Structures are given as C-alpha cells and as structure tokens.
Design a protein around this ligand. Structure first.
Ligand code: C6I
Ligand code: C6I
Ligand code: LYS
Ligand code: LYS
Lengths: 450, 450
C-alpha cells in the first residue's frame, strides 16, 4: 500500500526535482570517514562536504537524524527545509546533504539538502530465492551480499593479474560457433537472422584457444561465460564464468604447479589468508604443497585389487554392483564414488582413462592413460589440466569414437594438421573457485542468476 | 597432394615421437635475441639454449639452414641426425633444437634436435575471407595479423587498466536473460532444457549494470560480447565486444570527459601516439580537446532553418524528401545524412530527441531533448554517454511508448523504484574503437569472425 503514498510524493514534488540530473557530491562517506578517523566526539570541524546516501534509518525529532548508507555499506536541524525533510523523505530514498562534518554526543554531517532519488518502494526490513531474484535489494540490505559481490570481483581481478604477470595474453574467442566443442555438454542453439542457420553458444573456448597456439601464441587465457544446456545443481549452472589457459612447451605436470600458485595467489590477494574460514565454524588450509595421486592406483587401493587400463568393463561393472557404459566412465565413477568423496585436503588426481579424455595426449610412458589431471579443493571438482593432444590423426580418431557414440570439427582438425607445438591447457570454474574458497553456494557467487 | 606424403612421414616416424608430450625449451627466440643483440657476426658463444620454432624456410646443403620462426614472428650440421633432418623435416613443422648460439657469415643456433609437431599441411606461400576462416594460418604467415591480434589485446588491457585506475569495478552480468534490454536490436533466442523456456542472449548489460548502481555500486563496467541478431556490415557484426560504464553523481558532461581521456589513454598505451597513422597514407590527430555540438542547432545550421523538438514530422519529412517514421528518427537521420558525414575531427554530438532515447534522462533545462551524447571519431559512431533516467514512472512511460510501437521489464522498473542515484552511463564498441584507431576493417579486428 505504501507503494501508492510514495508515487504521490513523487507526483506532488514534480518544481522540486526528485530525480535530479546532477548533485555536486564532493566525497563518498568512506572518503569522509577515512578523512576524520578519530574526531573528538561532540565537536565541530569546518570541513564542508557535499555527501549523498541512502536514508536506511530516520529519527525525526527541531532536529531529524538519519543514516545515510553509501552503496558500499559505509555509514554517516530552513524551517521549510525541516518540513520538506519530514514530509518528503522516506526510507530507501537517496539524499544529498551539503554541510559541516561533526561527531554527535557517531560521525555526522550537519547547510543544504536535496532528494537525489525518491524510492517508490520501502526496503524489506529474505528467502534465498528472493535475495537472488532481487540482488539490488539484497545488496542494499545485506552487508554479506556487498562483500560477496566485491570478492568475486577481487578474485576475478587477482586471476587476470596472476596470469598477466606470467606473460599470458587474454584473447576473445567466438561465443557463437557453427558447432560448440572443447567439452562434453549439450549446447544452447540460437537461430541467426543474418546467415539463416542455427549457431551454438560456446561450451568451451578450448578448440579456439588451441587455434591461437597453432597461430603462434606462447601463452593465452580467456576468462568468460560458457553455456552448458544441462540441469543446474549446487556445483552446476548452465551459464557460468570459466578460466581456460594454454602454455606452449609445458605438460600437465607444469600446469598443475601454475594452477596451485594461481589459486594460492587469489586466496592471498582476494581473501588475505590461505587458512580459509568457512561458515562451518572450521578453517580449510590450502597453504603449502598439494597431494598428487594417480586415478588407477588410488582406485585400486580403495577397492583392494589391481585396476589398470586393461581391467574389463565386465569386471568394473561387477565391482560397481557390489558397492551400490564404458571403461573410462566406470573408472571415473568408481574413483569419484570411492577415493573422490573421501578427499579433504587439496588434491590433484592425474593419469586418466584415454576414453573419457578425447582432447588429452596419451601418457608419455603409461599405456592406456592420458596426461590429464583434476584438482579437488575442499571436495569440489575445481579445475582440470591436460598435456594437450597435438596429433591430428589420433585427434581425428578420438572424435570418430565420440561421434560413433557423423560430422567432426574439420577446421579444428585442419588447425592441428598445420602443427600445434606441445602445450598444456587448464580449465577452472570461477563459481566453484569461490564456493571452494568461501563455503558460499553457487547462487550466492554470481551477481544475477536464474 | 603433399597432404598424403606428410601423413606418411607421420606414420613412418611413429619409435620417433612427432607430437612429443614435452621438449625442454629453455628460451623463446625473442629471449635469445634480447640476450645477444650485437654478436660479432661469424663468431661462437658457449651460451647453450633449447629453442623451438616453426621451420618456415629450409636450405638443405653436410649442412642444412632453416628459419625457426617463434609464434610471435621472431626469427632465429649425427650423420643419421642430418639424414633424419632432410627426410623428416618439411615446412610449417615445429622443431626443437638444443645447441650453441652463434651468428653466421644472421643469429643462428648450431648439439641435438627433435620434431615438436609434424605439420600434415604446408603453409600457403590469401583472400580476406580465407584469412578470416583460417586465422591460425593468417597468424603464422602474415606479420600484420600477429600485430593486429596483439593490439586488440593491448587496447582491451589498456581499457581495464584505465577504468580500474579510476576506481571502476568490472562486474559479470547475465548473458542469458528472460528478456534482453539496454538497446534497440532483435535478440538471439535459445531454448533452455533446464527451465523449458526460450532465453535471450543479452543485447546490452545496461539494465543489469543499472541494478548494480541501485545495489550500491559507485562505479561499474563490463567489457564483454553482446548479441544483436541483425545484419553484419563494415561497422556492424551480430556478436561484438562492447564496453559499458556507469558512474554515480555524474552527468553526460562528466562521462564525455572520461570517454575522451580513456580513448586517448588507449591510443597511448596500445599505439604509442595520438597522431594515428592510417593505411590511407594519412595521420588522424585525436590529441587535445574534442568539439561538442548540439544535434538540433548543428542540424539547423546545415539545413538553413530552425529545427527544434517542436518541428513537426510533416516538416522534417519534407526536408528529408527535398534532400533525397517519427520525429526523433527523422532528426537523427537528417543529422547523420548532413552534419554526421561531414565530420572529420573527433566530435561529441549531444542533446538528443527524447523519442529515440528511452533510457536517457530528459535535459536539465532544454525541453524536448535528453542528456545523451554520441562520439564520432574518424567518422565512425564510436561511443554514446547518457545522464541516466532514474525516474521509474517516466521510465515506465518511455517503455510503454516503445511497446505500443505489451510486457515491460518490470524487474528493472522495480529496481529503479527502489531508487537509483543520479549516474551517467557510457557504451563503446571495441571493434569500432580499433577500426576508428587503425583504419582496419571490423573482420580484421576480431580474431575469429564469421
Ligand atoms: N554446468 C556447469 C558445468 C561446470 C561448472 C559449472 F559451474 N556449471 C564448472 O565449474 N565446471 C568445470 C569444473 C572443472 C574445470 C572446468 C570447469 C563445469
Ligand atoms: N551489430 C553491431 C552493433 C553495434 C556495434 C557493432 F560492432 N555491431 C557497435 O560498435 N555498436 C555501438 C556503437 C555506439 C556505442 C555502443 C556500441 C552497436
Ligand atoms: N575445455 C575444458 C577445460 C580446459 C582443459 C584443458 N584443455 C573443460 O571443458 O573443462
Ligand atoms: N546500452 C547502450 C550503451 C550504454 C549507454 C549508456 N546507458 C547501447 O546499447 O549502446
């Protein structure tokens, strides 16, 4: 109902300007605080300032007292002025005030005032799914939302800083592709009016990033959304921000180091500690070195028998039954369903079934396995790293097998047959990075989900 | 045909490794050059280096001589080794060589060698539309492609640096939206499997970025692709990288300054001069201050009569006929078709027909016009800046009018009725920025178009 009284204060203000083109705000409230950090309380200083702020509290009394909250969360007596103030000023109203900075019997500004923005809705004094459907109000009313938003920003900025330092170059590769490669996922398809064909929202930059390496790039990344037309869950969302990285004259052993160094550098710059406090009352250490295990061996120890590339699916099936399609898939599933869930400490698992790893080079010594890793941090599948498959004929086969389960990405296969140097790729989910770092749920990490 | 001989050298090399997982490359060729800048030519130095390089030239003679070109473009005698070399090594083959750095009777490496990547295609010794459909080969064979790629990268990095310095925060807003607002364009629609509904690939971050400002952001940007399901031309492509920017307690007069300062800072950091050399043999100065003109006045002087907001469409129609839908549209079209095309120097045109500017605040004094500008640089529509419309009731109307020409973006209108501070937005096309800066065509600016 208060929706209508506010709209009526708008209408009756309209030769007063409730949405004025400008106001001469001289300082943010942070700026005013950082200025006057220990003012002898109940004393006046002649520093004049134009400040603005959301009136999130009032206390009307010859003298009104409000709380102007700046958008970051920082907080900071005309007879006709006072009347206007009382009659015109609600809560969730953005308000400019020019005057002398004092401190009360709390830092306050005491000469002029004007409405910067008249709110036609009061602030709710919030369900998880009304915080996310209205992040703008979440951000106004919940200091955690304001912190979470600025963390992702600081994390993402730490990432670019960490890669750039290492002489990586961020590139922009197509989001609309004639076919979407670089991952096992169902695409989002959109009809082009221009070309009168369907196009595919990238699932991954990998194949394009690989064309760059052929193209002569030493070190490339892309930090940007990918689109996986599948079901959202606690670790999955169909649109998500991803990092991918490609370094020439390195292997998965090289990219494992960098991936660690990167994450530890992000914890530092964004969070200021590797002793990650969680909402579980606990602290998750990610400092120091991280344990590498091979999938097969680790799976074997867990099952109490030797599982190799050579282990039949008939065998694996049986073991999977005893616990409650293909070899590679069964290995990964068993490994996840056994060792995976057990892992607490940050852990690289490497040497992957050649089946479930089409783009990854076969292992240098070990037959049957590919030089891929996965990084598990705080029990979340965080980040993968490959020694990259630069053999077009093999690559052609891997895809052939894929298709059989039949048009291939011929341009990509063309690119490879020009010659790709030996290079190691990584992928890493930013939402998972934040989840893994914070204990925040995926829906809290992104600004505007649905 | 050489496609088959190469595939046969692959097959016959396979216990030689033509795609080896690693090679111990110690330096890039740049690194080796930067190391030995003025070596007394035809003299040997005992600095040993593992280098790799694309053999883009051969000259087989007891002694072969190649050109190893590093991916950036930089350039740098076993009897059985020599035989292998001759028989095994083609052109466009990536090759590692360990040995002593010397200079010939040209800087050369003279101990071991190995194939890093066997190319199953030779390099073409290129049509604009086979350079773009094969950028990986363009990048190998055309030093300009290598420069253009690294410029966009440096431009984009200059942009983030320039904004970040000014205390802007890059945010990630949805690419898939339930409806796509922030611009006049037909969206790309994709069916979600998750939600079983169509979603819309953002045309612009504007409405989401505006929710951020409501949310309490002081200064935000987003630098990232937008999707405009319309026809590609010399200045238009349906997928393009865009900058958008929003500053609280500023007007279009404020955002005009920043837009200039930003572009001039990008010229500097990326190009190293404001005297932009063009392929037209000419130099385009963008240094110093830039001319602001009002659309109406400038249009008037060009037509030789007074055109105001009040000028009828019947009148404007007539004038448009005399030269060869709505007022706002006719004004903009006439202005473009007259003053626009005439402009050489970098020029802001401001004070826009309220019709064609729904999201832009009405002018503070001048009735009928909105506080929008457009920046024309070297005759290209580069960048727009608004004093932003924070009046939800007005905003509701602007959209109502739009629709009538009927579901509105109610969540956005909700956001505004919580209160948005006075803020000024900008948009800027990155491809146009590069075109405007270089004289390069849009298809040359993006890595992977189609
Ligand atoms: N639907 C999805 C799918 C994924 C993610 C997500 F948030 N939603 C994610 O982080 N993924 C991977 C995790 C491993 C390294 C690359 C990113 C996949
Ligand atoms: N289909 C399209 C549409 C546009 C652009 C482009 F390259 N392709 C572009 O640069 N636009 C504008 C130019 C004005 C300021 C914001 C960017 C629109
Ligand atoms: N494309 C991978 C990430 C890069 C892995 C290294 N090639 C993924 O979808 O997870
Ligand atoms: N959304 C605008 C750019 C931002 C203008 C300032 N609000 C466009 O489509 O060009």
């Amino acid at each position: 109902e208060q929706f209508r009284i506010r709209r009526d204060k708008r209408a009756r203000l309209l030769g007063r300007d409730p949405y004025p083109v400008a106001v001469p705000r001289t300082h943010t409230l942070a700026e005013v605080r950082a200025a006057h950090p220990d003012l002898p309380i109940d004393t006046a200083t002649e520093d004049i300032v134009g400040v603005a702020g959301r009136v999130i509290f009032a206390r009307n009394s010859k003298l009104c007292f409000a709380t102007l909250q700046d958008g970051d969360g920082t907080q900071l007596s005309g007879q006709a002025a006072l009347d206007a103030w009382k009659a015109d000023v609600d809560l969730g109203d953005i308000v400019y005030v020019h005057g002398a900075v004092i401190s009360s019997r709390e830092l306050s500004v005491l000469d002029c005032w004007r409405i910067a923005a008249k709110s036609l809705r009061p602030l709710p004094v919030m369900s998880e799914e009304s915080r996310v459907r209205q992040r703008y109000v979440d951000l106004i009313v919940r200091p955690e939302a304001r912190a979470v938003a600025r963390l992702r920003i600081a994390v993402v900025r730490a990432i670019r800083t960490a890669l750039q330092r290492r002489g990586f170059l961020e590139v922009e590769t197509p989001v609309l592709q004639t076919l979407a490669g670089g991952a096992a996922a169902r695409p989002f398809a959109t009809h082009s009016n221009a070309l009168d064909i369907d196009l595919y929202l990238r699932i991954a930059p990998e194949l394009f990033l690989k064309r760059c390496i052929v193209g002569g790039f030493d070190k490339v990344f892309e930090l940007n959304r990918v689109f996986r037309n599948e079901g959202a869950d606690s670790t999955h969302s169909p649109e998500f921000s991803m990092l991918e990285t490609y370094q020439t004259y390195g292997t998965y052993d090289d990219s494992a180091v960098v991936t660690r160094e990167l994450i530890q550098e992000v914890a530092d710059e964004a969070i200021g500690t590797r002793q990650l406090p969680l909402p579980d009352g606990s602290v998750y250490d990610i400092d120091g070195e991280w344990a590498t295990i091979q999938m097969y061996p680790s799976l074997s120890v867990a099952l109490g028998e030797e599982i190799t590339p050579q282990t039949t699916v008939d065998r694996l099936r049986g073991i999977a039954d005893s616990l409650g399609f293909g070899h590679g898939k069964l290995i990964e599933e068993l490994w996840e369903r056994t060792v995976g869930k057990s892992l607490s400490a940050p852990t690289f698992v490497k040497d992957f079934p050649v089946q479930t790893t089409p783009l990854t080079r076969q292992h240098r010594s070990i037959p049957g396995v590919t030089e891929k890793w996965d990084l598990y941090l705080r029990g979340i599948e965080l980040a993968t790293g490959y020694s990259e498959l630069s053999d077009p004929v093999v690559q052609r086969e891997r895809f052939a097998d894929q298709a059989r389960a039949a048009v291939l990405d011929e341009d990509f296969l063309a690119a490879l047959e020009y010659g790709m140097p030996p290079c190691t790729g990584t992928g890493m989910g930013i939402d998972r990075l934040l989840m893994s770092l914070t204990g925040l749920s995926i829906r809290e990490t992104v600004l505007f989900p649905i």
